[PDB]
Amino acid sequence: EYPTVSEIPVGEVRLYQIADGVWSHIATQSFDGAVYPSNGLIVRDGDELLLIDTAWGAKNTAALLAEIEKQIGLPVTRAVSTHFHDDRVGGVDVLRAAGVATYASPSTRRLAEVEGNEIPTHSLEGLSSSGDAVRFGPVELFYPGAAHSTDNLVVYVPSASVLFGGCAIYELSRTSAGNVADADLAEWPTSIERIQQHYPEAQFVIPGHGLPGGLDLLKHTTNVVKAHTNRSVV
Ligand SMILES: C[C@H](CS)C(=O)N1CCC[C@H]1C(=O)O
Numbered sequence: 412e413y414p415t416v417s418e419i420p421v422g423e424v425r426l427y428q429i430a431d432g433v434w435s436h437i438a439t440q441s442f443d444g445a446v447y448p449s450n451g452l453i454v455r456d457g458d459e460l461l462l463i464d465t466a467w468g469a470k471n472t473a474a475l476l477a478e479i480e481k482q483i484g485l486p487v488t489r490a491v492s493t494h495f496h497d498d499r500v501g502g503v504d505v506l507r508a509a510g511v512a513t514y515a516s517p518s519t520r521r522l523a524e525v526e527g528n529e530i531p532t533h534s535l536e537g538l539s540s541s542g543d544a545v546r547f548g549p550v551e552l553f554y555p556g557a558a559h560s561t562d563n564l565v566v567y568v569p570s571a572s573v574l575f576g577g578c579a580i581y582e583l584s585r586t587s588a589g590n591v592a593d594a595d596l597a598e599w600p601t602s603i604e605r606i607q608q609h610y611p612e613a614q615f616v617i618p619g620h621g622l623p624g625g626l627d628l629l630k631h632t633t634n635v636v637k638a639h640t641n642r643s644v645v
Pocket residue numbers: 442447496497498578589590620
């Protein structure tokens with residue numbers, strides 16, 4: 412029942428209720444002739460909403476805000492970007508123009524600036540060291556260490572046992588490495604194990620792209636990352 416990439420035209424966004432007060436948002440983009448889905452999160456924060464990640468681009472993110480207003484009807488007051496790539500910060504300006512306070516760690520903000528990407532306004536302190544966690548309203552933000560990117564955060568919703576792994580966690584259907592241009596392959600397995608150790612009670616695990624699963628997505632990602640690490644150049 413989870414929206415798949417073939418059921419969402421580029422430019423459109425779907426919302427999927429994972430648990431009470433927790434949705435994922437699903438959008439798509441074309442890259443090199445293939446179409447990819449991308450997930451973020453929406454978490455109820457009292458009578459407001461906390462958004463995790465843009466919908467991968469300005470047009471998708473405007474659609475995301477319109478869909479949230481249509482389907483949930485609560486204001487998005489804050490957004491957190493979980494790393495510096497365009498599926499996480501692309502659309503920050505749209506959020507900012509709609510009165511959303513945008514947040515990212517200093518490490519994400521510096522990497523976004525280096526890349527020429529959009530830069531969230533606010534800085535999330537207390538996340539610079541692997542294993543650091545901070546509360547952000549109804550979620551905990553956790554920096555597991557470098558993995559898919561040096562700045563990647565994961566987001567845990569304690570009330571719902573939902574772990575948003577972002578692009579550090581692969582869906583099961585991905586059996587070869589995705590974008591690793593900014594990754595720390597050497598540290599990625601260790602960072603995943605930090606997630607396991609910190610959230611062993613997680614019941615829903617949402618990857619940055621593709622179908623949700625459980626904590627099995629973690630060891631699956633480790634297996635894929637190690638296979639890529641050991642690729643043989645002949
Ligand atoms: C824009 C995103 C950031 S994680 C990306 O690089 N993706 C999306 C999944 C694969 C890979 C790609 O370049 O296609």
